[PDB]
Amino acid sequence: DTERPVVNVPSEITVYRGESFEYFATVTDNSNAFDLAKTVVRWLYSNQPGRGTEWLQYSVTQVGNQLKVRIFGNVPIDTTIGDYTRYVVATDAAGNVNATQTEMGNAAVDKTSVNGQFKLIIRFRIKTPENTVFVNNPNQLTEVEKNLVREAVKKSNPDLRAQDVLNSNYVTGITVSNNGTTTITYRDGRKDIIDGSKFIDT
Ligand SMILES: [Ca+2]
């Protein structure tokens, strides 16, 4: 047995602050025999969930000739928004691994991928304002009205901190168009858009 086990894991695992998550990976091997205790989910440097993502949990079972790796946890309300490279590293009974420590290191530095590699994305779960913002012209808000909109979005999303948005500044990170459509750009460059028509009226 020189054939390595193969992990099937989604390319992105997206989790939301203040919520639980649950995803699965699968492992197969020509031998159908595994070392479950040496099948882990980890960051590059050591067999650990990783700095900043200490809440990333996993558990492994065997179902027929495959492993199922449950990837789960509870995301703190104030963990950093952004993404991380993580790895499912599986071992077969013969000791073959899907990705070696050296391969993981090359992939990290070169920005290439190994089998079992996934991007862990921490997102904010945006909420549309509950209370309507009343404006004189819904197709052309005043600057005073756009600031009311920013305030409403901040009040409807109280766990969104200044350090969570672009440039760590609410004014740069939460931008309002002429019709009140609001883009929230997070510190990682990802964006959520709230269409003005869902909370703006005349
Ligand atoms: Ca094998």
Class of secondary structure makeup? alpha+beta
Helix content: 10-25%
Which architecture of the largest domain does the CATH hierarchy give at level 2? Sandwich
CATH fold description of the largest domain: Immunoglobulin-like
Characterize the largest beta sheet: strand count, sense, and whether it forms a barrel. Answer: 4 strands, antiparallel
Distance between the termini: 71 Å
Give Rg in angstroms.
22 Å
What ligands can be seen in this structure?
A: calcium ion
Kindly provide the name of the CATH class of the largest domain: Mainly Beta
Range of strand content: 25-35%
PDB class: sugar binding protein
Keywords: lectin, sugar binding protein
Assembly: monomeric
Entry title: GspB Siglec + Unique domains
What's the topology here?
Elements: E1 6-8, E2 12-16, E3 20-28, E4 40-42, E5 57-63, E6 66-74, E7 82-89, H1 101-110, E8 117-123, E9 133-134, H2 143-156, H3 170-173, E10 174-176, E11 182-185, E12 191-194, E13 200-201
Parallel strand pairs: 2-8, 9-13
Antiparallel strand pairs: 1-3, 3-6, 4-7, 5-6, 7-8, 10-11, 11-12
The structure holds calcium ion (CA).
